[PDB]
Every structure is written in C-alpha cells, then in structure tokens.
Subunit: 345 residues, 4 copies
C-alpha cells in the first residue's frame, strides 16, 4: 500500500510502498477515506535526534476516518463496510480517567508504551490503518469523509476546551477565540451551537477575520498591540468571560491575560515552545483559571459528530492526494491552507 | 465444578456439577473467591414462568470477586493471579452512556442480548466464572475477598445514588437512610466518608438501629407512622436535604415525601412492586427531585474500592460454603443475615 | 390611581381608584409600564373562602416591569427613571438558599409573612407599585416594556426548569416541550439559544403547533393518546432526554413517562390539582429524575433579560388597557390569547 | 472606644481612643467579641505612600465576630444580643456575581467605592464596629467567639478554594496542602470533613508538621527540593489530584507544578509579590488548571460555620488584648503564632 512516512531525522516526509497490515485479536483494519493534516505531524518532524523516540519509519496522520475492512478475532459491534472516525488519544482503557472515557488524560499510557496513531503508532496517511480496539471507533453514518476527518481533532480539541467551562458561558457571557484556522473556525461554530455566548474572533490576517464572520462570529478584531483595548471596547470594559487561545504564542497569551474577566477562564490550546501564562496575584484577575487542555474525551467525539450530522458545523477543507502529501505539509508550514488540509486515498 | 443454580420454575436453587468454562477471545476466566447474595437473585426465582426469560439452568450470583485464572486471546492489562472485582451491569461498551462508563444506563444492551452475570449470564456462585471483557474487572489488591464481594452492589448502588446529588450534601445538610441492611449499612459509611452531612438512619428492628450507630449514623429512629415526626424533631423542622430509601415500600416512600426539604432529593433504591413516589404540586415540596437509580458506573466501582482500601468501609458479612447456598437464600428471605451474606468456594 | 383588584370571593376582578402608595425605608416606588396576566392570578381567584388568606382587597399582577419613580430612605443603586423588571418570588434574603439568590426556594418566607406581589402583596396591575427591596429589581435598559413583562415568569420559570438539567442537553439530545402557551413558546426559544438539543413541541391546538414552528421547534405533534408513539417515531425509539411539561395534567405527565429516556428528566412545571408523576420501578425508566420546579433564581432572571437584549427571544403578546383587565382575564380562562397577555397603564 | 489603627505611612499601628460610631439606615452596630490578625493587615501597612489609598486613620481587622448592639432604621432579621460573624469581602449586592452570593468576585465594588472592613472601611480591632448591611452578618449561635473569628477568612478562603474543585476529590484522590499556618491548618480539616481525599501537608518547620498531624493530615513532609519526590513516593507515582498552596512563594508553586496530576488542579492562595505559576505546554501536565482564588462566597461562610458547629474544626488560636495588638502584629511578621492570632476586647 501507498503511505506518507517520516523516514530520517530532519528530512521532509516521503511517499513509500509498504505492507498492508493484518489485524490481530481485538484489532480492526480500516480502509482510509480521509486523513487530516495538523501541526502535531510537524512537531514530530521538527524534534532533534536526541529527543525523538516515536521510531523510524513512522506513517503520519493522527486525524482519520475510514470504512471497516477486516475484523480481528473476537471483535463485534462493527460490520465490514461501516463508516467510522478514529478516536485519536489512545489510553489504557482501565484507569479512573479511561473508565470515564477521558483517555486524553490517561495516567498510565506513557508507562505502558501506548502511543496514538501518527505519534508513535502508524497513522492515517496510508490506504489502510490498524486501530487497536473497538472503543477507538465512532460511527459517522453517511457524513462526507472529507468534512468528517477534521472532526477528530480540529473539532474534538476545541469542543473539549469549551466543555471544561461551559457552565460559565451563559447568556450575557463573552468568549474570545484567538486564531481562526483549522481549530479556531470550528471553535467559533461550537460556541454558537452549544451556548448563548457572544463570540469575538482575533487573527493576524484579514482573510481569516472574513472566515470568522462567515462561520458566525459576532465581531472580529486584528491581533497584536491594539487587540486588548479593542476587545474591551466591545465588552463595555468588563472583560471576556473565557478566552480560547488556539495560537498560544507569548503575545496571544499576554492579550488573553489583559482581557479575561474576574472569575473567568483562559484555555491555552495552541502550542508554541516556551510560551506560558503567568498565573499569580496582580498578574491575572481574581478567580480566573488557566489550563492547557489536550485533545478530548470519547463522549465528546460522539457529540462533535452529532453536531456535524445536525448541520451545525461547516468545515472548510482543501483536498490532496497521497502523492501530494509532502507538498501539503509545505503548504501547512507557510500557513496557506484556508481551514483544514485533508488527504484522500 | 460445583455451582448453585436455578434449575426449574418455582423451586429452590440446587448445588450441581457442571463444566468449568473456557475463555474465548477478549474473555477472562476467574477463580471465584467470594460471591454475594442479594435480592436480585430472589426476584429472578420469584418470576412466573410466562415472565421469566433468563434461561434454564442459571448459575446465580451477580456480586463477585476472584483471581484471574486464564486470559483469552488478545487480553492484556491483567496477569494470572491478579485479584479483581467484577463490574456487574454489563453494557454494550460503545454508546454515549457506555463511553462515559455509565454502562448501568446503556441504551443498547437489551437489543444486543447482553445480560449481567447472575441475571441471564452465568454468575459468581461457582468455583469459576467467565467475564466478557477486561473493562468489567477492577483490581482490588490485597483486600479480603469476603469484605470486597459486597462492594460490587451493596457498595456500588448506594455510592451511585449518593453521587447523583453529592453537591446538595454540604455542611449543615441532613441525609436520611431508610433500611439498614446490606445496602443501607454501607450507604451510611459512604455518606460519612464523602460528605459532611448529618446522617439519620431508619429501620423496623432495634438490632439494625444498633448496626446503624456502630457504622457511624448520628441518630437512628424507628420506622413506621412515627418516623416522619421523629426525623423532623431531629432536623428542627427544616426537613431532610436528601432521603435514600433502600426499602422502597409505599409506607417508606410516603415517609420520605413527608420529610424531604424544599429543593431536596428522594432516591428510591429499594424495589417493592407497585410502590411509587407521587411527584406533583401540593404532594411534594417545590424543587424536590425524585429518581429510581440503578446500580452504578465503572468509575464509581473504582471509587468504592478506593474507600475500602483506605479503611473507610466496615462491611458486615456472614460467610457460607457453596453447599450452604440454598440455605443461605432461605436466611436472606426471612431477613436473618446481619449485613451481607457471602459464599466462599 | 387606577388598579385591577380582587374585591370579594367568587366574583370577577374590578377596576378601582385607590391611593398611590409611598415607599418606606428600603422600598422603591415604580411607575408600571407593563403587567403580565398569568394563571397564578386565576388560581388565587378560584380558591374557596375557607382556603383564601391573601387578604381583600388584592391588587393583581405578579409579572411586572416599570420605571423607578421614588426611592425610599437609604436606597442607592438606582436613579429615578431607571427601567426595571420585578423579581417575583420574594424570599427572606438571609437563609442559605437566599444567599445564593435562590429566593424561589427560601425556607423561611412562609413563617415571616413575606408574600409575592399579586399573591399576598399588591401587584403590578396598577399605575404604580411598591417593591420591598432593591435586590428585587433587575435593570432592563431600553427593552420594550411589553415584551419584557413576560420575562419575569413566562421567561424565568422555563429558564430555571431547563437550567436544572442543562448538562444533559448536549448535541444529540432531544427535549420535548408539552404546551405551547405563555411559558412553552418561550421555553422552546430558550432551549434553542442555550443548547444544541433537538426540540419537539406538543399541543392540542393546530394553531399552537404553528406557533411552535414559528419560534424554532424542529417538530410539532398533536397531544393526546397518539403523542407518545409519534414522539418515539421522531427519536428513532431512544426516547427523549428531557420532557418539560408546561400543562401538567395527568394525561401529559403519563405521555412524559412513556417517552423519557433512561437517565433522562421530566420537569412538571404546569399546575393541575391532583396530577402527579408516579416514580417507581417498572413505571419509569432507570435514572430518569422528576421534579416540580417553582419560578427561578435572581441570576436566572438576569440571564433571561440578557437573552432578550441579545435578540434571542421573540415574545408573542397581546396588549390590553387597565379598563380591559377583567375582559382579558376572561380571554385567559377560555385560552384565546396567543402567547402572553400584557396590560399597559 | 479603644481601637488599633494605622495612623501614618511606614509606622507600626497604635492603640487610640476614638468615637463609638452610630448605625445609619440599613446598618448594624456590633460589640466586637473577637478580631483575627491576618497578613492582609500587614500588606496594607507595607504599601508605599504613592500606592496607598485606604485613608488615614484606618482601624485594622478584617476577620470579625460580635454581638448585635444596635439596629439602624429599617433593619429586621436580627435582635439585640445575637452572636454574628462578619462576611468580609463586601460587594455591591446587585450584579450577576453578587446575586449568587459571590460578592468576593463583585465586578462593580471598585467603581462604587465599597471597601471591606479593615481594608478601606473601619475594621474589627476595636470595641465596636459598623456593618453596612444585614446580608453581611451570619449567625453563629453559642460558638466560642475566639474560635469563630478565624472562620471568616482562615476558614472561608480555604473552604472556597477547595469548593471550586470538590468534584475532583473523590475516593482515591490526593490533596496536597502547602503551608500549615492560619489558613493551612483549617484547610486540612475542611478536606477531611467534605471529601475522602488523602491529605498530605507540607511545611518548612517540624513544629508545623506536628500541627498538621494533630489536625488530621495523613502525612506531613518537609518543604524544599525533595518535597516533590517525597509526595510522589506517598502517591505511588501518580501525582496529586489537587495542590492548595497557602504560601505562594516561587519555590512552593514550582513544587506544586512538579507534583500535580494530569487533569488536576493548583490553587495559588498564598500571596508573595512576583511569584506565579507558569502554565504552558511541557511546563505543567495536560489538563491541570491553575487559579488564584480570593476570599469566599456568602453561602460558603455559612457552610464553614456549620462545620464548626458540628465539631469538625479544631481552630488553634493565641489570644491577645487590644493593648497587645501592635505587639501581636510583630509576632505575626516573625511567624511565631501557632495558628491564628485573635484579639479579644
Ligand atoms: N492542545 C491540543 O491538543 C491541540 C490539538 C491540535 C492542535 N493544537 C495546536 O493548535 C494550534 C492551531 O492548530 P491549527 O491546525 O488550527 O493551525 P492552523 O495553521 O490551521 O491555523 C493557525 C491560525 O492561527 C493564526 N495565527 C498565527 N499566529 C497568530 C497570532 N500571533 N495572532 C493571531 N492569530 C495567529 C493564523 O493566521 C491561522 O489563522 C497549533 O499550535 C497546534 O499545534 C493543539
Ligand atoms: N436499584 C438498584 O440498583 C438495587 C441494587 C441492589 C439492591 N436493590 C434493592 O435494595 C433493597 C435492599 O437490599 P438489601 O440487600 O439491603 O436488603 P436486606 O434484606 O439486606 O436489608 C433490608 C433492610 O431493610 C429493613 N426494612 C425492611 N422493611 C422496612 C421498613 N418498612 N422500614 C424500615 N426498614 C425496613 C430491614 O430490617 C433490613 O435492615 C432491595 O429491595 C433490593 O432489591 C436495588
Ligand atoms: N411552576 C411554576 O412556577 C409555574 C409558573 C408559571 C405558570 N405555571 C403554570 O404553567 C401552566 C401553563 O401556563 P401558561 O401561562 O403558559 O398557560 P397558557 O394558557 O398561556 O397556555 C396553555 C397551553 O397549554 C396547551 N394545552 C392545554 N392542555 C393541553 C394538553 N392536554 N396537551 C397539550 N397541550 C395542552 C394549550 O393549548 C395552551 O397553548 C399553568 O398551569 C400555570 O399555572 C407554573
Ligand atoms: N487569597 C486570599 O484570599 C487570601 C486570604 C487570606 C490570606 N491569604 C494569604 O495566605 C497566606 C497564608 O496566610 P496565613 O495567615 O495562614 O499565614 P501564616 O503566617 O499563619 O502561615 C504561614 C505558614 O506557612 C509556612 N511557610 C512559610 N514559608 C514557607 C515556604 N517557603 N515553604 C513552606 N512553608 C512555608 C510557615 O511555616 C507557616 O506554617 C499569606 O500569604 C496570606 O497573605 C490569602
Ligand atoms: Zn493535532
Ligand atoms: Zn488509562
Ligand atoms: Zn443486587
Ligand atoms: Zn452501551
Ligand atoms: Zn405565573
Ligand atoms: Zn430565605
Ligand atoms: Zn486575610
Ligand atoms: Zn456586585
């Protein structure tokens, strides 16, 4: 089968021909219908040799949808041909966190050598992929695979970050979304569907502010030095109830601390090495909590899929072949994909 | 192997010799160390022939603990010899409820023909038992098996019922426990461990009021017509924040409605055919919710086990052999077991 | 001043001329701009003489909005001319419930002789009214008074009932609304604004099903014997996550019990003497809670007003003069007001 | 009357003779029975002249209990002689936060010139004090005033910090308490009363580790570089579910980040200028939230009082006269008071 792999340290990924795998007991083989491109795949390829420990070769792609091709021994609950999304952050399945479906916060996965697809285990950028367990598949019915692949991380991650503080986002609340890309443009639409919060979007690029307005933001403001004062002019001086930072650079976190309300929330979702919120007295308002969330829970992926099936999420994508995989990663590095890149085998 | 089975409709259970089973893919064989006796086994044996559909024969026992004897193909996460409790209310493992570990509220188990051990699938009253999946086992370490078997239902069910309204039970709150038997005497101890609620126990029998005080109730009162006024004398006339009725007879539910506070809770846990709360205006205080909960979640069983391991639960038991199984069920019918009956093979 | 009063037992209310009151210390005098008509005013007038204890005469109207006319001694936080809604369910202000703004569940108001406006204290169906305390006023800014008066009960009561179980109403959930009148037509719009639940409306009258669709219900079905099966055909057989019954007749509660999902909720909001849910095993699904809520909290009234100011609530009203008050109550008895009746002085 | 006042910038507080005040409309005069000494009074006296804006003179003491001496015009709900604790963080009483009793997070108090007693308004270190409003008094019944004064901040602040994440602290959880002084020794006892968490105390001083064990900590460990690993040896490697840092120095926050579990919580309660948590990827575990809470809510003070009345809180105090006030502040600066200092007029 054709696959896109990271083969040596520092080099760009290449297209290869490798064996189609076979499912052992409890496993499921999927024929891949769509694989998302995210910055997690870039992060893995930008590690120095001394820090890298995901193995070589590594099939990329941690966002994946497909159809069930073959069932391993003892697997029931799915038939051949069933369309399914892959739950990405694989946990042990047995700890207190995993027992509530919160495998994203599994306290044992590191020690057991359980790694997610595309980040240690083979990913979705191939004609076929193995899924370790039935509990990591979610049915998608007749949802278009191209629009569904982004739901497994571009949808799941913002959905989770929002869900952690949903009781704060009542009528009269304000939510700020910083960064209107793959994650951010889906986050705006989740906020509108599951809350009555007023939504203010922030980005560097005028074209991304246009995208923000297209997907339902109430206002959109230019990022940088003027952003904090512009956000406060919109909120009448009270501050934003919640800030969802999908950039996570030091300057965007600083903006978040300058606009968050007393008893509010900052969610640092975007990943920039070294950047951090400074949570201490006189540096942040009283009662304003801060967290770096990771991925999402099993039930949250099901809820994101239910939003898509009800017509509440317009996912903006650009489609690539497997041969175009390397080129699509270059496009992702330069920030020229409007929404989520998706590879179709 | 020796086992206690229901073999014909209307007759008492008998001791039999049947095949020791073999675990298929995904399954685990346990050597049973302790099996609890509950009223669910009685309910099953008291069904008329036209209503019964659990199959004959049926190995009894839906409360169970054991040691892992054999792993079926593909099972990891457990080694041979590991001491484990069985999670009883088996769900499909795939629906929204099951994805949060709430298999007690699985919306699909009926349609798929998934039945709990002792209530359609073979139970724990035997030398060995099959468990369908690794996710239905919880490690217990060096906990005494006899004191651990009751935790799987006598512990789990009250823990769940309490957990549904735990935020109501702050300092200054009052919780009433009606019925101090297998479930009720564990429920009192859970309330004391996980809340600052004042606990008032209610029973017909002076010996059970003594048990209530032994396990930490702040007061204990006689059941019947005078119970409502006696409870109100203890609460200064304000009413009880929550009432956990582990009897569920019409007279105890009536008492619960007469004592519950405004914005309080009644949990109807005990099962008496035909009995029901009457929830309407002028029949119950404003904002007082009522529910019939069932069993508990996976994470809740783990929490109950953590309470036992920390020394917070003194489980009162009487021990029987497998040969004494039929006799022990007669003892349970007449209400002469002080706490939970447990069979040890 | 002109006012509409209940003057003798069994008779219809009459228009009268009475003294304009003066505010004592802590009190505020409002010039009334709009007063809602609800069934609470009917209930008060339909009491037998032996049960009635609200005093005679009694100025009707427990839904009220106005402008601050005069401040009593020591009152700050409002200026003359400020537009305000009246928080209806007056509590003691000092107990545990009142300290969280939950004055609807005040445990002391009965014993202290604190009565709501229109139900023991003089109501809003007059040119002026006294409000006891500053904490019972909520600013409405430039909101149209006619559309704002219904918010104080037709808005507040459904908002509260929904808020009690909002975490259940995620994407993929279904909420059933029974009765599309004053409360029900606002309840549909609250569900759409603060959740992603699919909304199914139920009523006897085809004209009210039309109203339901106008205000955003996803489906609307005829009430009565066929309603349960019709609701289950729409939910694919799974049942409704929550049922909000704004009728509360025995037949509608029965329908609610036949459609509610496992681990769901029934809110009995409508008031029909004698009617009640029957909460017991085999009469309702496992884990399905039932409650009769009353009115709402202070913070909830503020949130309802914030929804109105954001344009999320289209309140259907018919306007009457004070002279037309008696006639408007006859219209309310026969069910010929489409939405909420409102009196404008 | 005698009082302890800050009279000029940079100087120590002095004992003075000033007028006994009279209560205006809505106000209550208390005869003070006990006044706590906290670091908030130190912070106020250590401000440079250009930053100080609380006025001179300033009567110190923001922890206070007393008996009602005189009622201002229009005040009901209290009789002369009633024993009461003062709710410290005075809010406007009208905003969304204040309507839920969360006056600690009032968004409007600054703009309205409402200041707490001892921090802008006259405090409790005097024979008498004015309280602005009846809603800022909580009845204490026959509680010893000396043990009750600390409850208003040493009790309230930890109770609030704990309450924000109480659902995380189930059986099997671990809570770390850093700093066993006024706040910390009460925080340990709250954790034991309202949760089943294992409690690990941390301090620099062996005498304070002894105090931790006296008030019910399950273990006590020396602070500094080895504290992290010592806490992990006690938790079997999993990390602490929640860390309550009542010191808030950079070294204790660093310790907190090294021990907190995935999906856990750090509460930075102690105040050290410049110190802060660093919340960013690779510096803190996934999902671990951080906050600086302030004081507590009205309902939380009531709950703390209910804990004291049930015998769940042993408050360690040292008693001083008003003449000893200045000396007692010197003792507080050098850290030589074992628990909470309390002044008795
Ligand atoms: N926490 C998690 O589990 C998780 C999961 C997935 C992705 N991520 C991270 O989220 C981030 C976003 O991912 P994506 O796929 O949506 O990225 P993307 O490239 O699709 O979009 C980036 C967007 O951010 C904007 N942007 C860049 N710098 C900005 C600034 N200073 N101010 C405002 N806007 C700015 C860009 O204009 C663009 O609109 C990445 O850092 C990624 O690593 C985190
Ligand atoms: N909802 C669930 O998931 C669930 C799970 C397990 C058991 N149950 C049910 O819980 C109930 C109790 O189970 P158990 O094993 O504790 O029973 P048990 O026989 O061990 O205990 C019964 C106790 O209730 C007391 N009692 C009986 N009638 C009473 C009355 N009118 N007033 C006060 N006290 C009275 C008895 O003296 C005894 O102490 C049963 O009805 C059982 O079927 C429900
Ligand atoms: N719990 C509370 O705090 C509270 C507060 C306010 C009102 N209420 C009660 O709520 C109820 C509704 O109040 P409202 O002012 O909206 O009434 P309304 O007269 O404005 O509307 C009643 C609606 O119910 C419909 N209806 C009647 N019988 C029905 C049936 N069997 N099935 C389906 N639909 C039916 C009617 O067609 C009508 O549209 C009243 O009983 C009132 O007393 C309760
Ligand atoms: N956030 C709030 O609302 C709030 C409210 C009240 C007090 N506070 C603050 O809380 C802190 C504690 O107040 P308190 O009155 O209990 O103080 P305290 O002086 O009574 O207690 C200090 C305790 O901390 C210990 N300690 C000091 N430095 C330490 C270190 N580096 N490592 C470990 N332990 C150390 C001491 O040995 C002592 O046990 C202060 O900073 C105070 O300003 C905050
Ligand atoms: Zn990603
Ligand atoms: Zn795990
Ligand atoms: Zn049972
Ligand atoms: Zn299921
Ligand atoms: Zn009404
Ligand atoms: Zn009250
Ligand atoms: Zn303090
Ligand atoms: Zn306020």
């Amino acid at each position: 089968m054709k696959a896109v792999q990271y083969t040596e340290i520092g080099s760009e990924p290449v297209v290869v021909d490798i064996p189609t795998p076979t499912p052992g007991p409890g496993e499921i083989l999927l024929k891949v219908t769509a694989a998302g491109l995210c910055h997690s795949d870039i992060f893995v390829m930008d590690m120095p040799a001394a820090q890298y420990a995901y193995g070589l070769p590594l099939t990329l792609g941690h966002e994946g949808v497909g159809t069930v091709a073959e069932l391993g021994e003892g697997v029931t609950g799915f038939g051949v041909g069933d369309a399914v999304a892959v739950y990405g952050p694989w946990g042990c399945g047995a700890c207190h966190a995993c027992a509530r479906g919160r495998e994203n916060y599994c306290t044992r996965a590191a020690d057991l050598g359980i790694t997610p697809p595309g980040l240690g285990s083979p990913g979705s950028m191939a004609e076929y992929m193995i899924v370790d367990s039935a509990r990591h598949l979610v049915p998608i019915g007749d949802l278009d695979p191209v629009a569904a692949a982004p739901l497994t991380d571009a949808g799941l991650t913002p959905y989770h970050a929002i869900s952690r503080v949903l009781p704060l986002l009542g009528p009269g609340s304000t939510a700020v979304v910083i960064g209107v890309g793959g994650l951010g443009h889906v986050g705006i639409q989740i906020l509108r569907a599951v809350s009555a919060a007023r939504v203010i979007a922030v980005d560097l690029d005028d074209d991304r502010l246009a995208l923000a307005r297209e997907v339902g933001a109430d206002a959109a403001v230019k990022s940088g030095a003027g952003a904090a004062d512009a956000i406060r002019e919109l909120t009448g001086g009270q501050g934003a109830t919640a800030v969802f930072d999908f950039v996570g650079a030091q300057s965007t976190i600083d903006t978040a601390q300058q606009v968050v309300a007393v008893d509010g929330h900052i969610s640092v979702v975007g990943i920039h090495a070294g950047a951090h919120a400074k949570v201490g007295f006189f540096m942040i308002p009283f009662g304003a909590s801060v967290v770096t969330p990771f991925a999402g829970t099993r039930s949250e992926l099901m809820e994101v899929v239910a939003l898509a099936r009800a017509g509440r999420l317009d996912i903006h994508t650009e489609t690539f072949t497997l041969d175009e995989g390397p080129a699509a990663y270059r496009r992702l590095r330069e920030g020229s994909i409007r929404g989520r890149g998706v590879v179709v085998p």
